[PDB]
Design a protein around this ligand. Structure first.
Ligand SMILES: [Mg+2]
Ligand SMILES: [Zn+2]
Ligand SMILES: [Zn+2]
Ligand SMILES: [Zn+2]
Ligand SMILES: [Zn+2]
Lengths: 171, 147, 141, 107, 670, 168, 112, 87, 56, 101, 95
């Protein structure tokens, strides 16, 4: 989940940008290619920590191109998916074979064989919802979901989920 | 099928070129067509453009000249078998290999004209001039006694 | 899968496009726009400059023998082993018929076209209940 | 330090490397009829301390292996009686600077 | 094109690791499961069957597939499948090592002959290069031809403990043909019982006994566990090569033109399916052994055909089937002829003629070649107008352009280009243009021997198609004008062009490093002419000396004084050559005459760049240890010497014109 | 290296990740332990760096209120990056909706308790991420909570953690 | 004494005619051929059977055998050789390569 | 490991910039003129990027630094300004 | 054969003579540090003559 | 320090033999200005005369020793086969000659 | 035109190695391949339209690198792994 770790990342830059103020330019660069990024190793990368006293300190010019690269060691906040953790995420879109819960970065989906059969599913709902006592997909749609595995692949990350557990699903 | 850019106007109705006309380097002289029969002959996997897969032979793309005296005669088993001949003048140029009768190979430096050629009392202008330093190294007295 | 590449200029789209090939540089250009489509063409003549499968069929014929840097003791084993797979195929009888029609056509001094057309005529049927043997020479005649 | 008149049986040679840390060596008289160093082609040889070897390694930033070798069965090696792990400095009369440093490791 | 740029983080090679393949891993990276020996024309039309030739691997030609990774032809690296085998086979790239290791370890026990109880092999295990340890183990293991469970007597004072596994022997192993046999003497009856049985060493039992070896025994035997374990050394499952390595040549009338490698693989599949059907049905235990021997034979022959010459194993016609050591041998066997040398681009090849008016850093280049070649540039605020004008000049007129490159993967060709006078040529772009003059250019002549033959040059473009160069550099080029041909290359980027300009140009290659003396030189004809000029007895007139003084390009606008005045100004050839010699240069010769009032007129002495006396001769002015060229290059700076050769070459040439010089038979007879 | 299989099921019962070890090394050569962060403190600490980089950008051109924050950092992030981080708006919405304490000082006092107790880091980070109040239903929901920790001690720390947090 | 005598012999043979070359080239050759504790002819077998990288070792025409031995042994080459950098298509750390080119933001600001 | 560098003092390389890195710095300066990165020496109408680079080196305000290597792996650092272009 | 024998000999920045692995051959290159260019066959002026002419 | 002082010993003996005081004052007649000028020029040229780092010295050595082997001749074995036997030992001699003083 | 061994030797003697590199790339193959150094193999498929770089036989989706190479060197490499061989890593690991 929401974790802190030291990360070192290398970035390059075009040789036309060799002006006096390039440290802040590199900083700006580090913000847009750190922000909005999901990797398989560390999940989704949220934002950066410790903006000041950043360490770049040296770069190498490529021999065949004027581009120069720069490694950046930094602290950051990242989300790390895992297996078997009850979370109270929210649902935006639903399907007939199962609702698609959006818990933070993922769209965790529960397939037709993992909803409990004692849940009183109604087909005539817009969106199709699986409600028994209070677990209704709403504008809030807070449903206790457990991600028993987040299947990271070629980078379209999807998590699998289940509500086949007592108090899981219901809120 | 997959036509060249040969500008095929130099051929006639028999698929040959009439002799005596001039040809450039890339120009076509012969024409072929694939006789298979059976391979879904002219309506399969291609447009119409019937059954060419055309392997027409262009001339070698540098030399240019005059075609001359095209003959056609059946081969050993009896087919349509074609030979052509092209005639091309080549005026000597700067880069030709000329040797003596004694091994004085080389090439041609430049050419001037008679208004600055070296010339004698009877005006006998030379045909060609070489370096004396061939002589006392290659030890070719036979060239001099021949002259 | 449909197994299909179609080439189309991404900026003219008037038809299946009026395109040309520059074999002297091995590239293709839409003649209207003047942009390349693809590069590094493969030659279509140099392989014929480099070096009867329809009558021998899909299975491929192979004669084996001796060389210089080999031994007679095992090339005679090879010469007696070259017939250890002729019974797996009917192509031994196909090539026996091919050899015998070669015997006949060159005996009557018939040319290469007549020889290959007789090869075609055998390869055409080569096996029917109408054929049914019939001395094996009547079919070649 | 042993000198034999002629050949020695291997049944004597098997217990030659006995009693460590004592070391045993054998020479032939005809192998030592001539002082090999007094030949003018061989350069001067000189021994090192392990301290000096460690100083050399930390100065030239080498690690023990890329340095050029010398065989244990060399005649100058048996002359100096050195064993494995010892470093030999060698000075020869060079023809562009006269005196010239060099180094060998016993292996 | 633009080569389909993606977000793969690009870096470089740093390390390479070798090894072998585990059959499970090569099956895991396999995609294809080939069963049909024949490939094309299903029943029998097109679109090759799901056996060979891309069901699900790299595509054939022009097409999508490349197992639907959509990389056409020239972006797909190939894709990989595999084949299964009935029985495991040997391998010709290991046969000797197999014999050594099966001699070494004990079969039926799976334990080493020797384990830390002879001090000799203890120190043999201690020594570690990679393989001299292995050679020691191999020469120690030849004897003690029984494996034992209780060897060690002198590990203890006199006592015996339990070490080994089995009391069996090893059989005496004789290498034979393409297999292995063993004769277990084993001598276990009441008598001596010398009765060995010669049994074929079955690849299954060698595989299983290799599977029963310890990892520490692999480390002792030089097998790295992670990459090299001897069951991988025996072949069970065979990978396939992709269609690019064995390409169909499309043999230009009707054939796809299948080649040697696919041919041999089809033979391998046919033999494998024959063997598996034979063993599946009733095997009479005679044909099955020679059949599996044929399987091993054909996989060995496909592997290489340069084996110990008991077979030859060709395929029709009479040319032998070309295996892989033939593919990768010497003399352009894919390594020397493809990696440390290959074909190139931007190349020229003609025949030279001399010229006395072009200095050393130039070269004469014919204009057809300058039309044919190219060179990329960039678009700056500086080059914009000249580049725009040259683009308007078209692909024909001699400062000409052929290609333009915009921001993306853009190749617009100027030959068709019906929007010709319309492109605005924005910044950040690349254009291709012809060779304008004084571009840096690298030169070659076959065959190269030393640091010479590799000069760089500038260019003055010349008509009347051929090359042209300076008469100076001819002897380090090691080529008279007997028709030899040259080789030319053009750099593409600015780093390369700069380093050619700063390093491989002539004026810092004047002295050869190899011969500790300058190896350039003024040569034969101008040498003879300057010997004619330097003589005391000759002089010269105004109409000459004026013309030579204009002929020197860096003349100061000052005439020298008359040497001798009285009816006529006149000058010495030494006096006029002193103009061409630049200032402040000093030399002494002093050989055998030279008493400062030289009667025999030898020697040479120059003060302040002016000749005083002497006879110019090759042993002073040509290539020598105390050379004049050596002096001026070492002192003044090694590019003024280029103009020095230009000056004295032009002057001696133009004076020799109106002088005239030759020989004849009247020299010879006496 | 030999495919490096290391087959581990990930669970909350000290069944850790393959890369997220307890012990690493850092760039300074010192030992870098594992760092895990709860939902509440993660939402608190992200705003520090957010306002720090916002005033840092304001200085670059020179040279707890969550209803404000959900639109405010949307404006800041669309100022510098694109509008593609609706996913990030959803993650911070998860960070701010279901974290156990809205304010900062209750979480800080919880951390000041935990630095003296010295509990298991991953266990108490999971406890801070989850939002529950009674230990036995927390145990029946999570078998790691069932087996790792005694219920009486879990309850006696759960009440002095749950008194501080703002109830929802 | 062996490398001194060897250099003397090769100097006599090549100085019999066509002399001369600088001493340093010949001395470099003699000493690199002797610097293994013993004499080593530069053959297919002689210098090549050493702890030397596999790609230079396979550039000398013992190819199929040396690659199979290298695959069996499964060792590494650091690719700091000219042969490896050429056949893998990179600049070798050689001549123009024996160094690297660094960018300094501080020096850029200092000489703005 | 142990920072893999050396301070700017006690550098034991030569203080003379030599031919290969000369060629490299001239080539790189041609690349920055090639993609219109700003000039530092004033212009005199010449447009040749090599000439611009030669003039900039001669007036000695090239804003680049250089790193050398040693067989261990540790590196030195130098600016082109504290080097002296002598040859 | 010989140009295959001597590929990778590369003088480093420490004036040594190593290979790709780093096997040093000449600790100072060529025993002088002088290149293959600045060389003349000049003479020393000490050996020749007499002791008497030397001190003269 | 020992290597640096040592490796220029031939240079320093030559330099002292050339610039001995009696010889320079009896045949060379310098000024103080010219003396300082010639010292500065000598040291500047020596600093310009160092081995450049990064040369392919063994490759250049190889090509230098390779060039004159094409101009060879063919008693005592000489020429190309003698060179090949010497370079490519071959525990075999064809000329067992030894010199004795 | 043939570029030969001795030509490569004297080019090494000049030491214009960046010229050597750009000649041997741009006047020749100039290829591109994705690999997986966790495999060390050649086999990584690339759905480039969808940025999908699955590694079957290694089932990892992070170890994905592109390098520039000879198609000559790939001909060698795919041939060699057909000949029961070659891992190719991406950084040093020894110092
Ligand atoms: Mg090595
Ligand atoms: Zn178009
Ligand atoms: Zn593909
Ligand atoms: Zn046993
Ligand atoms: Zn992988």
């Amino acid at each position: 989940m929401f974790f802190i770790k030291d990360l070192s990342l290398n970035i390059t830059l075009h040789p036309s940008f060799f002006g006096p103020r390039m440290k802040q330019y590199l900083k700006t660069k580090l913000l847009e290619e750190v922000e909005g990024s999901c990797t398989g190793k560390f999940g989704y990368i949220l934002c950066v920590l410790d903006y000041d006293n950043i360490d770049i300190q040296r770069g190498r010019i490529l021999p065949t191109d004027g581009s120069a690269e720069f490694n950046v060691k930094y602290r950051a906040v990242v989300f790390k998916p895992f297996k078997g953790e009850v979370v109270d995420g929210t649902v935006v879109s639903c399907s007939q074979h199962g609702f698609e819960v959006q818990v933070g970065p993922m769209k965790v989906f529960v397939t037709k064989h993992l909803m409990p059969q004692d849940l009183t599913f109604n087909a005539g709902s817009n969106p199709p919802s699986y409600q028994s006592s209070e677990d209704v997909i709403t504008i809030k749609s807070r449903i206790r979901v457990k991600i028993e595995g987040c299947i990271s692949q070629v980078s379209s990350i999807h998590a699998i989920g289940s509500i086949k557990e007592d108090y899981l699903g219901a809120i | 099928l997959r036509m060249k850019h040969g500008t095929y106007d130099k051929l006639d109705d028999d698929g040959l070129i009439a002799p005596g006309v001039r040809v450039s380097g890339e120009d076509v002289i012969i024409g072929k067509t694939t006789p298979i029969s059976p391979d879904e002959e002219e309506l399969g996997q291609r447009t119409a453009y019937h059954s060419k897969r055309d392997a027409s032979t262009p001339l070698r793309s540098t030399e240019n000249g005059i075609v001359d005296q095209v003959l056609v005669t059946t081969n050993q088993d009896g087919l349509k078998f074609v030979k052509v001949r092209v005639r091309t003048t080549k005026i000597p140029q700067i880069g030709d290999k000329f040797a003596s009768r004694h091994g004085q190979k080389g090439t041609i430096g430049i050419t001037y004209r008679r208004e600055d050629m070296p010339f004698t009392a009877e005006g006998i202008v030379p045909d060609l001039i070489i370096n004396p330093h061939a002589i006392p190294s290659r030890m070719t007295v036979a060239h001099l006694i021949e002259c | 899968p449909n197994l299909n590449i179609v080439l189309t200029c991404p900026e003219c789209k008037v038809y299946p496009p009026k395109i040309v090939e520059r074999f002297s540089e091995g590239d293709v250009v839409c003649a209207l726009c003047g942009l390349v489509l693809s590069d590094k063409l493969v030659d279509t003549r140099s392989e014929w400059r480099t070096f009867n499968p329809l009558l021998d069929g899909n299975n491929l014929s192979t004669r084996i023998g001796k060389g210089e840097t080999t031994d007679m003791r095992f090339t005679k084993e090879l010469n007696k082993a070259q017939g250890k797979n002729v019974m797996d195929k009917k192509d031994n009888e196909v090539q026996a018929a091919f050899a015998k029609i070669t015997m006949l056509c060159d005996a009557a001094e018939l040319p290469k076209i007549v020889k290959d057309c007789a090869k075609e005529a055998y390869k055409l049927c080569h096996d029917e209940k109408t054929l049914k043997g019939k001395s094996m020479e009547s079919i070649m005649a | 330090i042993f000198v034999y008149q002629n050949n020695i049986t291997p049944s004597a040679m098997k217990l030659v490397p006995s009693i460590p840390p004592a070391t045993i060596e054998t020479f032939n008289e005809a192998a030592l009829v001539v002082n090999i160093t007094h030949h003018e082609l061989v350069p001067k040889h000189i021994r090192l301390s392990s301290d000096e070897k460690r100083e050399l390694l930390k100065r030239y930033r080498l690690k023990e292996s890329q340095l050029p070798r010398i065989q244990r069965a060399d005649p100058v090696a048996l002359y100096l009686g050195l064993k494995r792990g010892e470093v030999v400095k060698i000075i020869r009369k060079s023809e562009t600077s006269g005196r010239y440093a060099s180094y060998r490791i016993c292996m | 094109v633009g080569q389909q740029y993606s977000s793969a983080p690009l870096r470089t090679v740093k390390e390479v690791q070798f090894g072998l393949f585990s059959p499970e891993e090569v099956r895991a990276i396999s995609v294809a499961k080939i069963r049909f020996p024949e490939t094309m024309d299903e029943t029998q039309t097109r679109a090759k069957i799901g056996g060979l030739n891309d069901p699900r691997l790299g595509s054939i030609d022009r097409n999508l597939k490349c197992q639907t990774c959509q990389e056409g032809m020239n972006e797909c690296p190939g894709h990989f499948g595999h084949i299964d085998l009935a029985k495991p086979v040997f391998h010709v790239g290991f046969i000797a090592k197999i014999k050594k290791v099966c001699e070494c370890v004990c079969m039926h026990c799976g334990k080493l002959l020797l384990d830390e109880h002879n001090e000799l092999m203890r120190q043999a295990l201690a020594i570690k290069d990679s393989k001299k340890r292995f050679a020691a183990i191999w020469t120690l293991c030849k004897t003690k031809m029984v494996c034992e469970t209780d060897v060690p007597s002198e590990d203890d004072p006199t006592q015996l403990v339990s070490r080994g596994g089995c009391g069996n022997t090893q059989p005496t192993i004789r290498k034979d043909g393409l297999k292995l046999v063993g004769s277990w003497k084993k001598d276990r009856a009441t008598g001596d019982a010398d009765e060995p049985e010669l049994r074929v060493l079955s690849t299954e039992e060698i595989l299983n006994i290799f599977k029963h070896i310890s990892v520490k025994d692999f480390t002792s035997l030089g097998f790295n566990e992670v990459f090299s374990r001897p069951e991988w050394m025996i072949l069970t499952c065979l990978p396939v090569p992709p269609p690019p390595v064995r390409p169909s040549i499309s043999f230009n009338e009707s054939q796809r033109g299948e080649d040697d490698l696919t041919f041999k693989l089809a033979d391998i599949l046919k033999a494998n399916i024959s063997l598996e059907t034979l063993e599946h049905n009733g095997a009479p235990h005679h044909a099955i052994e020679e059949a599996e021997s044929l399987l091993q034979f054909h996989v060995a022959t496909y592997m290489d055909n340069d084996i110990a010459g008991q077979p030859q194993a060709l395929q029709k016609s009479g040319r032998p089937v070309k295996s892989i050591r033939a593919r990768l041998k010497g003399k352009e066997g894919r390594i020397r002829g493809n990696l440390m040398g290959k074909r190139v681009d931007f190349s020229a090849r003609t025949v030279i003629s001399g010229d006395p008016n072009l200095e050393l850093d130039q070269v004469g280049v014919p204009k057809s070649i300058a039309k044919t070649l190219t060179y990329p540039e960039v678009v700056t605020p500086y080059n914009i107008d000249r580049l725009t004008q040259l683009v308007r000049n078209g692909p024909n007129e001699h400062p000409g352009a052929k290609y333009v490159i915009r921001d993306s993967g853009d190749r617009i060709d100027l030959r068709y280009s019906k929007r010709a006078g319309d492109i605005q040529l924005q910044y950040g772009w690349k254009v291709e243009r012809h060779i304008m003059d004084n571009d840096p250019v690298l030169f070659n002549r076959q065959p190269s021997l030393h640091k010479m033959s590799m000069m760089a040059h500038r260019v003055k473009v010349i008509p009347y198609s051929t090359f042209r160069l300076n008469l100076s550099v001819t002897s380090p080029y090691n080529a008279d004008f007997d028709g030899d041909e040259m080789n030319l290359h053009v750099p593409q980027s600015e780093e390369t062009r700069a380093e050619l300009s700063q390093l491989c140009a002539v004026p810092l290659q004047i002295v050869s490093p190899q011969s500790n003396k300058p190896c350039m030189g003024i040569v034969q004809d101008t040498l003879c002419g300057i010997r004619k000029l330097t003589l005391r007895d000759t002089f010269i007139e105004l109409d000459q000396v004026l013309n030579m003084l204009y002929w020197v390009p860096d003349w100061d606008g000052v005439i020298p004084t008359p040497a001798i005045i009285k009816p006529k100004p006149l000058w010495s050839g030494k006096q006029i050559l002193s103009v061409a010699i630049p200032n402040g240069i000093h030399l002494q010769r002093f050989d055998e005459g030279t008493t400062l009032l030289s009667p025999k007129d030898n020697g040479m002495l120059i003060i302040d760049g002016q000749i005083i006396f002497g006879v110019v001769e090759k042993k002073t002015v040509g290539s020598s240890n105390g050379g004049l060229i050596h002096v001026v290059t070492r002192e003044k700076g090694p590019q003024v010497c280029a103009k020095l050769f230009g000056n004295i070459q032009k002057v001696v040439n133009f004076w020799l014109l109106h002088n005239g010089f030759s020989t004849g038979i009247g020299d010879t007879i006496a | 290296r030999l495919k490096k299989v290391e087959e581990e099921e990930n669970a909350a019962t000290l069944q850790l990740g393959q890369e997220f070890q307890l012990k690493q090394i850092n760039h300074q050569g010192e030992e870098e332990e594992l760092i895990a962060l709860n939902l509440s403190e993660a939402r608190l600490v992200i705003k520090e760096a957010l306002v720090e980089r916002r005033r840092a950008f304001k200085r670059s051109q020179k040279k707890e209120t969550r209803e404000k924050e959900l639109e405010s950092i949307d404006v800041l992030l669309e100022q510098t990056t694109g509008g593609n981080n609706k996913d990030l708006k959803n993650t911070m919405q998860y960070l701010t909706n279901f974290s156990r304490f809205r304010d900062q000082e209750t979480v800080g006092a919880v951390i000041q308790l935990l630095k003296s107790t010295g509990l298991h880091p991953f266990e108490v980070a999971q406890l801070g991420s989850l939002a529950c109040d009674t230990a036995d239903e927390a145990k029946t929901l999570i078998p790691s909570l069932n087996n790792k920790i005694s219920d009486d001690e879990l309850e006696r720390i759960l009440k002095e953690l749950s008194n501080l947090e703002t109830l929802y | 004494a062996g490398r001194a005598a060897l250099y003397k012999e090769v100097y006599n043979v090549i100085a019999s005619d066509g002399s001369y070359v600088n001493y340093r080239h010949m001395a470099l050759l003699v000493d690199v051929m002797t610097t293994q504790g013993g004499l080593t002819s530069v053959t297919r077998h002689g210098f090549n059977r050493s702890n030397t990288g596999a790609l230079m070792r396979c550039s000398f025409e013992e190819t199929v055998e040396i690659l199979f031995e290298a695959g069996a042994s499964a060792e590494l080459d650091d690719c700091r050789g000219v042969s490896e950098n050429v056949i893998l298509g990179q600049m070798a750390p050689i001549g123009t390569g024996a160094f690297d080119v660094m960018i300094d933001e501080e020096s850029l600001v200092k000489y703005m | 490991l142990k920072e893999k560098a050396i301070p700017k003092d006690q550098r034991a390389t030569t203080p003379y910039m030599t031919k290969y890195e000369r060629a490299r710095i001239l080539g790189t300066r041609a690349l920055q003129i090639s993609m219109n990165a700003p000039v530092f020496v004033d212009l005199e109408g010449e447009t040749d990027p090599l000439r611009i680079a030669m003039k900039e080196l001669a007036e000695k305000k090239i804003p680049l630094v250089i790193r050398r290597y040693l067989p261990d792996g540790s590196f030195e650092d130098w600016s082109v300004e504290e080097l002296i272009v002598d040859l | 054969r010989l140009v295959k024998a001597l590929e990778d000999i590369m003088v480093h920045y420490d004036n040594t003579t190593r290979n790709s692995l780093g096997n040093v051959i000449q600790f100072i290159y060529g025993e002088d540090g002088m290149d293959a260019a600045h060389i003349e066959k000049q003479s020393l002026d000490t050996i020749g003559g007499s002791d008497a002419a030397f001190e003269k | 320090q020992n290597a640096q002082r040592d490796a220029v010993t031939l240079f320093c003996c030559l330099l002292r033999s050339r610039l001995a005081t009696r010889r320079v004052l009896q045949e060379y007649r310098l000024t103080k200005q010219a003396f300082d000028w010639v010292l500065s020029n000598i040291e500047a040229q020596f600093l310009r005369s160092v081995v450049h780092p990064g040369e392919m010295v063994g490759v250049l050595a190889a090509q230098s020793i390779g060039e004159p082997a094409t101009q060879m001749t063919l008693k005592v074995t000489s020429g190309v086969p003698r060179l090949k036997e010497i370079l490519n030992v071959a525990k075999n001699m064809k000329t067992p000659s030894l010199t004795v003083y | 035109l043939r570029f030969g061994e001795m030509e490569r030797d004297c080019m090494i003697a000049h030491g214009a190695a960046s010229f050597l590199k750009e000649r041997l790339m741009e006047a020749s193959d100039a290829f591109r391949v994705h690999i997986c150094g966790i495999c060390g193999l050649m086999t990584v498929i690339a759905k480039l339209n969808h940025n999908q770089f699955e590694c079957k036989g290694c089932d990892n989706k992070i170890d994905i690198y592109q390098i520039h190479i000879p198609y000559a060197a790939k001909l060698l490499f795919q041939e060699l792994m057909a000949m029961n061989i070659p891992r190719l890593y991406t950084d040093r690991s020894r110092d």
